[PDB]
Amino acid sequence: SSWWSHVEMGPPDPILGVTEAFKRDTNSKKMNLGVGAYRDDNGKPYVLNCVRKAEAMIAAKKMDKEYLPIAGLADFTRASAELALGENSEAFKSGRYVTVQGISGTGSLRVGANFLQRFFKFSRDVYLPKPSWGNHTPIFRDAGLQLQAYRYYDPKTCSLDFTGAMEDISKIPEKSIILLHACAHNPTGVDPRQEQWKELASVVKKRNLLAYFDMAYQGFASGDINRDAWALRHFIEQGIDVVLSQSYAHNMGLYGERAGAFTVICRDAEEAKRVESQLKILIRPMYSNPPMNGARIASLILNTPELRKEWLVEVKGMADRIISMRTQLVSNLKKEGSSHNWQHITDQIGMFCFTGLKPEQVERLTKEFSIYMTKDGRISVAGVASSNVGYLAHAIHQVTK
Amino acid sequence: SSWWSHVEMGPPDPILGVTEAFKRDTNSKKMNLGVGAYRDDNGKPYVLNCVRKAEAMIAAKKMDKEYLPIAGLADFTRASAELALGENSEAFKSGRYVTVQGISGTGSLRVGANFLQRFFKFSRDVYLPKPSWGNHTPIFRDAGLQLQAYRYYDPKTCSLDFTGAMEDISKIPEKSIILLHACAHNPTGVDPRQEQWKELASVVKKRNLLAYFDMAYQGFASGDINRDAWALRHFIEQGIDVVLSQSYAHNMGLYGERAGAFTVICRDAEEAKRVESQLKILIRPMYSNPPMNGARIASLILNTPELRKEWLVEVKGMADRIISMRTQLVSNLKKEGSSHNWQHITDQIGMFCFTGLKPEQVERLTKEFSIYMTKDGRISVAGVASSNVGYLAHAIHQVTK
Numbered sequence: 001s002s003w004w005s006h007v008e009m010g011p012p013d014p015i016l017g018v019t020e021a022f023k024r025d026t027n028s029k030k031m032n033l034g035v036g037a038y039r040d041d042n043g044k045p046y047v048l049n050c051v052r053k054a055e056a057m058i059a060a061k062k063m064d065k066e067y068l069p070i071a072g073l074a075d076f077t078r079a080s081a082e083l084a085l086g087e088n089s090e091a092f093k094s095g096r097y098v099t100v101q102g103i104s105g106t107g108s109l110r111v112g113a114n115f116l117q118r119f120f121k122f123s124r125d126v127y128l129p130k131p132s133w134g135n136h137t138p139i140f141r142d143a144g145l146q147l148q149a150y151r152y153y154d155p156k157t158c159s160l161d162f163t164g165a166m167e168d169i170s171k172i173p174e175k176s177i178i179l180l181h182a183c184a185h186n187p188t189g190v191d192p193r194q195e196q197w198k199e200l201a202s203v204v205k206k207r208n209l210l211a212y213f214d215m216a217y218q219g220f221a222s223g224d225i226n227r228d229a230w231a232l233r234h235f236i237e238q239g240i241d242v243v244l245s246q247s248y249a250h251n252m253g254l255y256g257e258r259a260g261a262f263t264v265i266c267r268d269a270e271e272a273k274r275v276e277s278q279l280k281i282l283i284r285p286m287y288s289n290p291p292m293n294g295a296r297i298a299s300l301i302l303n304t305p306e307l308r309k310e311w312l313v314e315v316k317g318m319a320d321r322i323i324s325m326r327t328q329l330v331s332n333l334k335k336e337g338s339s340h341n342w343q344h345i346t347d348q349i350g351m352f353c354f355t356g357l358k359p360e361q362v363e364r365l366t367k368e369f370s371i372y373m374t375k376d377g378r379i380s381v382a383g384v385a386s387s388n389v390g391y392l393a394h395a396i397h398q399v400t401k
Numbered sequence: 402s403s404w405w406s407h408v409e410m411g412p413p414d415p416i417l418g419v420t421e422a423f424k425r426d427t428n429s430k431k432m433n434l435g436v437g438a439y440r441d442d443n444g445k446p447y448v449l450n451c452v453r454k455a456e457a458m459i460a461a462k463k464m465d466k467e468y469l470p471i472a473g474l475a476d477f478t479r480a481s482a483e484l485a486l487g488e489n490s491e492a493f494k495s496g497r498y499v500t501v502q503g504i505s506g507t508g509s510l511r512v513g514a515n516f517l518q519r520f521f522k523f524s525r526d527v528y529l530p531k532p533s534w535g536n537h538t539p540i541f542r543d544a545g546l547q548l549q550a551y552r553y554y555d556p557k558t559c560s561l562d563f564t565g566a567m568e569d570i571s572k573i574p575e576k577s578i579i580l581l582h583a584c585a586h587n588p589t590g591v592d593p594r595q596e597q598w599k600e601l602a603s604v605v606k607k608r609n610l611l612a613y614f615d616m617a618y619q620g621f622a623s624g625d626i627n628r629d630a631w632a633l634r635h636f637i638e639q640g641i642d643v644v645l646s647q648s649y650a651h652n653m654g655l656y657g658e659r660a661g662a663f664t665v666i667c668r669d670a671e672e673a674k675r676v677e678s679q680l681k682i683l684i685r686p687m688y689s690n691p692p693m694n695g696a697r698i699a700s701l702i703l704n705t706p707e708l709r710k711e712w713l714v715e716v717k718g719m720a721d722r723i724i725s726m727r728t729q730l731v732s733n734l735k736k737e738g739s740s741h742n743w744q745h746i747t748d749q750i751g752m753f754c755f756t757g758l759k760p761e762q763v764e765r766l767t768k769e770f771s772i773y774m775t776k777d778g779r780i781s782v783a784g785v786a787s788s789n790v791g792y793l794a795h796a797i798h799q800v801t802k
């Protein structure tokens with residue numbers, strides 16, 4: 001009986017733990033369809049061309065590694081704001097925003113969570129969509145806020161239950177906080193339609209709710225970055241001052257370098273200044289200043305015309321491939337003779353498919369075929385390659401037959 | 402009256418803010434002696450040779466950027482443990498430790514702070530030495546613990562007030578938490594003597610206090626890394642199970658890449674396993690997984706014999722230079738005709754000198770000479786170069802005359 005005799009065995013992360021389990025299997029045909037990580041058509045980690053050139057630029061310049069200001073790389077901070085808001089945006093033009101480099105999406109989310117905990121005097125409730133990325137709970141819960149829920153997904157119909165959402169949302173207490181996924185909702189792969197978004201705006205505005213946008217997949221919903229930032233831009237434009245978290249982990253394939261940002265849209269550039277002051281203060285006693293590599297790479301691509309353009313081509317490339325894989329998946333299922341309707345697989349967008357498989361099926365999949373996915377039936381289509389869509393489909397079928 | 406009408410202008414970080422102020426001065430002779438950042442003899446940011454080769458190795462291998470496990474790079478985690486504990490260590494050999502990659506020193510410190518908040522059921526008090534790095538307060542305070550103090554520095558005598566420390570320490574309530582700087586105490590540059598450390602061990606052990614070591618400057622106290630880890634090793638060896646935070650920001654000049662680690666010494670490898678589980682759980686909803694670059698670079702140097710050896714030469718090189726600058730500083734002061742005893746400047750170790758200048762003098766220094774330092778009179782000798790020790794000394798003198 002020492003200091004930690006009492007500390008119990010905590011369980012493995014529902015998402016990140018799949019990769020740990022996957023790592024150990026000896027099956028040569030194994031597939032890691034758990035975390036949303038882009039794999040190229042060979043089924044290999046893919047580092048974009050533009051990322052590769054960004055890094056070379058950095059190398060060549062023989063840059064130092066001195067500490068970055070607490071808020072991050074100005075150039076990256078400003079270009080991230082700009083990427084979300086759009087260059088024409090009044091918010092951006094007027095400087096009514098504060099963007100701070102964050103430790104990827106998760107890092108940004110928690111900074112905001114912490115910021116709200118401290119400065120959002122109107123409420124302690126955060127409404128998450130049913131269902132949501134498992135991690136939104138703990139992120140909010142550890143920061144000190146309460147979690148609530150709003151209906152979103154209709155499993156019966158494999159789509160968004162708009163009526164349920166609107167009902168739930170029209171009733172959230174005023175001045176509460178609502179978390180919205182900007183695009184490629186995780187894990188359903190179903191976003192509201194633009195008409196739909198417009199109706200949500202109204203209710204949010206009307207109920208005077210703080211809209212918190214989680215934008216982890218800008219460019220993976222349509223394959224177009226501006227198109228994917230529509231909702232977000234629409235709300236700001238309707239006069240809704242949101243807070244936002246951005247991740248460059250998927251769209252730039254910067255996973256491990258941890259590049260991201262957290263933004264608050266304020267009333268004036270002077271409020272923006274005061275909020276920045278306080279955000280610095282929160283970040284300081286947390287990690288002091290942020291990791292420079294991801295931010296340097298992203299800044300160079302973003303601010304370098306030829307780089308940026310290459311990047312957009314590369315993003316289309318990625319989404320495209322994901323599409324082909326959905327398609328094929330479905331085809332192979334029919335080929336295999338599957339009786340089930342697998343239309344949701346091609347209807348869903350972003351990196352995954354919310355399959356509907358029950359936990360007994362998931363289990364079999366891992367054990368008989370060594371195909372790893374989250375227990376909720378969510379699979380990452382992002383990680384399928386031409387060489388194993390066949391295998392995937394056959395398995396799905398066997399376990400479903 | 403929007404959401405953030407109430408959020409007030411927070412002040413600039415007492416340490417990091419000096420660099421912000423410094424950045425704006427137009428004086429061509431300006432000197433940034435605030436943050437502890439190594440400058441080469443030309444007064445330029447210095448990226449070690451071995452760091453440069455580590456990066457080239459990485460480049461050459463065309464490594465991916467997939468996400469690292471929540472606890473960090475195994476290789477880096479294990480080599481950090483090893484760097485602190487020493488290779489012969491029973492703790493290490495036996496695997497009674499858990500080391501987790503942290504976002505530099507600050508990142509590691511806060512992870513531990515958070516861990517204790519959650520699992521240290523014996524107390525909410527953390528005793529810091531008087532004085533300490535300004536940031537220890539907020540780090541502990543934001544995590545949820547209470548701050549206490551123990552006497553350390555004797556300004557009258559420009560040294561460690563051992564009697565006061567021992568008195569204060571012999572009285573801290575049992576099972577409390579005491580933060581100790583492993584070496585190169587920040588900001589006094591005065592460490593306990595080995596005899597002294599031995600006496601501290603006893604009292605800590607006797608009072609059954611949780612010893613929390615902050616090891617930010619391993620190699621900057623003596624210019625020898627094992628020598629600098631003595632105290633730390635001695636406590637573990639006396640049967641004191643510490644928690645520790647390591648930073649590679651100064652000794653490897655990795656400032657902005659944010660590489661560091663947090664370790665807990667446990668009873669067995671099985672407790673170690675349970676603690677790891679819980680640490681993962683804490684990190685997950687905080688930043689998810691850590692920045693890979695700093696960790697990849699540090700892992701390669703540490704685990705690469707020729708790299709490691711080069712690294713130790715480079716560390717000696719750095720400490721040496723710091724020594725020369727102290728020396729010279731003092732010489733120039735006499736040359737200038739300073740009446741004061743400046744012996745503390747050469748007596749102090751690590752990257753700074755706790756000068757004793759009053760705030761009015763600090764102020765003049767910045768305004769007449771554009772020499773930036775923290776308001777407490779702490780200056781970073783680390784950043785002085787042969788070309789400006791003269792200027793420095795003349796200024797000090799003018800403002801002191």
Ligand SMILES: Cc1[nH+]cc(COP(=O)(O)O)c(CN[C@@H](CCC(=O)O)C(=O)O)c1O
Pocket residue numbers: 015016034035036037103104105106107133135181186214216247248249255260688689
């Ligand atoms: C909605 C969502 N929001 C934020 C993030 C933040 O990611 P990062 O920048 O790494 O902090 C992720 C990653 N979630 C995918 C990646 C694995 C993970 O969970 O992490 C996933 O759901 O598989 C999200 O899916």
Ligand SMILES: Cc1[nH+]cc(COP(=O)(O)O)c(CN[C@@H](CCC(=O)O)C(=O)O)c1O
Pocket residue numbers: 287288416417435436437438504505506507508534536582587615617648649650656661
């Ligand atoms: C005692 C101490 N502990 C931990 C750290 C953590 O540093 P990092 O790995 O960057 O998180 C520092 C840096 N403190 C010097 C560097 C500037 C800073 O304060 O940050 C300093 O005191 O100037 C310390 O001086």
